[PDB]
Each structure stands twice: as structure tokens, then as C-alpha cells.
Design a protein around this ligand. Structure first.
Ligand code: CL
Ligand code: MG
Ligand code: MG
Length: 200
């Protein structure tokens, strides 16, 4: 797998109404699945955490749980997102990022592990101010943030700012975007690039 190191990886998956149900089912859920396929989930390698966020953040995979460390178990849970009332609601990224910072506050994370947040989003946060404030607090605790933007509702400058890049210029290995139909072709190269940056 292209991601293979001691990393606590916090997947924050936008489930906002803008997505549309057909895209949630045909693209968003399969994209999260393929992303997880890029990870060596293992006690001594990657441990996954996952939440969804729209109105609020909701944990779906607990950090260090069996599904955190086992790809087949993680994929069952992600697939279970199909049998829900999702997608719906707004884009409370700051609450999603807050849940990550609560793990760090409470020392739930492996202190020895690289800390990586990966955001899948099709929009702009409802509060850029609070999202950037949370992101700074995470950065101060050593957390790297990556963003995979989808569709026409994103703001590239903001996503680039969030991950620590110049908003328009130069290579930004912690950022990629894609049209809805193409997400599964962009996610592999993205996760490869992200994991190279995390290891360096
Ligand atoms: Cl927000
Ligand atoms: Mg907030
Ligand atoms: Mg949206």
C-alpha cells in the first residue's frame, strides 16, 4: 500500500446535502473505500479514525478499535454509510477538526505516530475563521492536514491555505481535487503524495 508508516489517520468525510444522494452512493462512499484501500491498516502501521460531518461531526470508526487496524472491518463500516439518511445538511468542518483535537487533548492518539487529517469535501466550511483556528491548533500539535476537493462547490485557495500551501502557486502535495465522475482515478496518486509528505 502507498501509505505504510506509523500514522494515526483521521478521515473527515463531508456528508453535506450538496453532494446529492446519487453521488453519495456512486462516488463518495466508493471513494472513501478506495482511500482506505491505500492504507496499511495494522497495529504497527496505520490506525484509522473516521467521522462524517455536515451539521455536526459524527464518529463512525473509533481510533485504535478493531476497524481502525483492519481494512476489511473498516470497509464494512464505510459501506454501511449507504444504508442511512445521508447526505444532508451544511459543512461544519470546524466541528470535525475539533473532534480530532479532542483526541489529542485526551492523549488518545499514539504519541509516537505521525498525525494526519484527510478531509474529503465538496464545499467551503460554514466558518472559514473557526476552521482555520482549529487547523492552527492542530498544526501546533504536529498534525498535518490534507484535502481532497470534489466538484464545483469547493474553493481551491481556501483548501490550499488549510493544508499549508500558497493559495495558487507551486506544488501542493497535500491537496488534490476531482470532478465527481473521476474521484477514483485521483485518490491513489493523492494518497501516495500525501503519505510521501507525511514521511518527510
Ligand atoms: Cl465550519
Ligand atoms: Mg466551529
Ligand atoms: Mg457541500
Amino acid at each position: 500500500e502507498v501509505c505504510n508508516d506509523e500514522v494515526d489517520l483521521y478521515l473527515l468525510m463531508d456528508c453535506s446535502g450538496s453532494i446529492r444522494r446519487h453521488n453519495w452512493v456512486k462516488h463518495a462512499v466508493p471513494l472513501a473505500m478506495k482511500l482506505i484501500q491505500q492504507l496499511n491498516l495494522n497495529e504497527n502501521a496505520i490506525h484509522l479514525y473516521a467521522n462524517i460531518f455536515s451539521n455536526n461531526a459524527k464518529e463512525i470508526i473509533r481510533l485504535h478499535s478493531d476497524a481502525s487496524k483492519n481494512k476489511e472491518k473498516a470497509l464494512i463500516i464505510i459501506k454501511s454509510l449507504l444504508s442511512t439518511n445521508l447526505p444532508y445538511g451544511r459543512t461544519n468542518l470546524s466541528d470535525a477538526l475539533l473532534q480530532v483535537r479532542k483526541h489529542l487533548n485526551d492523549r488518545i492518539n499514539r504519541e509516537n505516530a505521525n498525525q494526519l487529517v484527510v478531509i474529503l469535501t465538496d464545499g467551503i466550511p460554514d466558518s472559514i475563521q473557526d476552521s482555520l483556528k482549529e487547523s492552527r491548533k492542530l498544526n501546533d500539535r504536529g498534525v498535518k492536514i490534507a484535502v481532497f476537493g470534489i466538484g464545483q462547490g469547493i474553493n481551491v485557495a481556501f483548501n490550499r491555505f488549510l493544508v499549508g500551501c500558497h493559495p495558487s502557486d507551486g506544488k501542493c502535495n497535500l491537496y488534490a481535487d476531482s470532478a465527481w465522475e473521476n474521484v477514483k482515478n485521483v485518490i491513489g496518486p493523492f494518497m501516495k503524495a500525501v503519505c510521501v509528505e507525511v514521511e518527510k
